[PDB]
Amino acid sequence: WSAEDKHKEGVNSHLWIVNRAIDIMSRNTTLVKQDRVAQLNEWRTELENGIYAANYENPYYDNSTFASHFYDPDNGKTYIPFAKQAKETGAKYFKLAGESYKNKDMKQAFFYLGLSLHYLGDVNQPMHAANFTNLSYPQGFHSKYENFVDTIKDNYKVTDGNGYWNWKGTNPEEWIHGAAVVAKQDYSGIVNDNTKDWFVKAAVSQEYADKWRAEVTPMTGKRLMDAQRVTAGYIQLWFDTYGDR
Ligand SMILES: CCCCCC(=O)OC[C@H](CCP(=O)([O-])OCC[N+](C)(C)C)OC(=O)CCCCC
Ligand SMILES: [Zn+2]
Ligand SMILES: [Zn+2]
Ligand SMILES: [Zn+2]
């Protein structure tokens, strides 16, 4: 997903997903301790820095190849042989964030959590769970799709307090893998002969530009809503794990 601006949801789908997940936690009045939401907002600057940094600097963006932002649940690999993938990388920052938290280094803890949330967010994007990059055919489709998502995401906000609490085990890797499994299933709903064909013809015909956008919207809405619920459960897990007990 996009992450063009560090603090603006308008062009940062990653930030939007996290903010909506926090809203889910805020709406939940039977399980979530609201002081957890207070802490996230207190260290929002560091959190947002982490969400953003993943796409703009080393080692997070792997020398501009973003290899660590991809993870195919079927073979457990990213799109470049032997490179690090989203599951191990996302889990790495989830744990680093927790250790910092336990040591009262809030700035470090929330920056790392932000990074971890970025990776979790990415595997919810079908293309990232299928190793379909901006260089995959049709070239350029990956980025144009994520840019389009920013224009319609607000129509798919989750408005209840039901996050996927304890969705998977206590191991963050299970959460990232689980999200990728579901996302890859919805891959064909976004990338297929039709959308590929229309995207290419969209170059000369606005008529076709509207066609592929419409075609991928339903599945996009579903993916965005799932991403919100999973992220809320992931954050809740982080606090249950490192928040004393
Ligand atoms: C020269 C143009 C750069 C565009 C690159 C791009 O759109 O990357 C998207 C994801 C990046 C992970 P993401 O979080 O979904 O990033 C989206 C936003 N952004 C690329 C602007 C940082 O990575 C790839 O597809 C790898 C191949 C790169 C080809 C040059
Ligand atoms: Zn992304
Ligand atoms: Zn992407
Ligand atoms: Zn990314």
Curated annotation (Swiss-Prot):
Q: Where does Zn(2+) 2 bind?
A: H128, H142, E146
The record lists the catalysed reaction(s) as: a 1,2-diacyl-sn-glycero-3-phosphocholine + H2O = phosphocholine + a 1,2-diacyl-sn-glycerol + H(+)
Q: Tell me a GO biological process for this protein.
A: killing of cells of another organism
- Which cofactors go with this protein? Zn(2+)
Domain Zn-dependent PLC, by residue range, is: 1-245
Q: Which PROSITE patterns match?
A: PROKAR_ZN_DEPEND_PLPC_1, PROKAR_ZN_DEPEND_PLPC_2
Q: Which InterPro entries match?
A: PLipase_C/P1_nuclease_dom_sf (IPR008947), PLPC/GPLD1 (IPR029002), Zn_PLipaseC (IPR001531)
SUPFAM superfamilies for this protein: Phospholipase C/P1 nuclease (SSF48537)
Q: Which UniProt keywords apply?
A: Cytolysis, Hemolysis, Hydrolase, Metal-binding, Signal, Zinc, Zymogen
What domain of life does the UniProt record list for this protein's source? Bacteria
Annotated residues that bind Zn(2+) 3 are located at: W1, H14, D122
Name the positions where Zn(2+) 1 binds. N55, H69, H118, D122
Annotated cofactor note: Binds 3 Zn(2+) ions per subunit.
Subunit (UniProt): Monomer.
Q: What is the similarity comment for this entry?
A: Belongs to the bacterial zinc-metallophospholipase C family.
Its biological purpose is as follows:
Required, with sphingomyelinase, to effect target cell lysis (hemolysis).
**What name is this protein filed under?**
Phospholipase C
Organism of origin: Bacillus cereus
Q: Which lineage do the record's taxonomy fields give for this organism? A: Bacteria, Bacillati, Bacillota, Bacilli, Bacillales
Q: Which gene encodes it?
A: plc
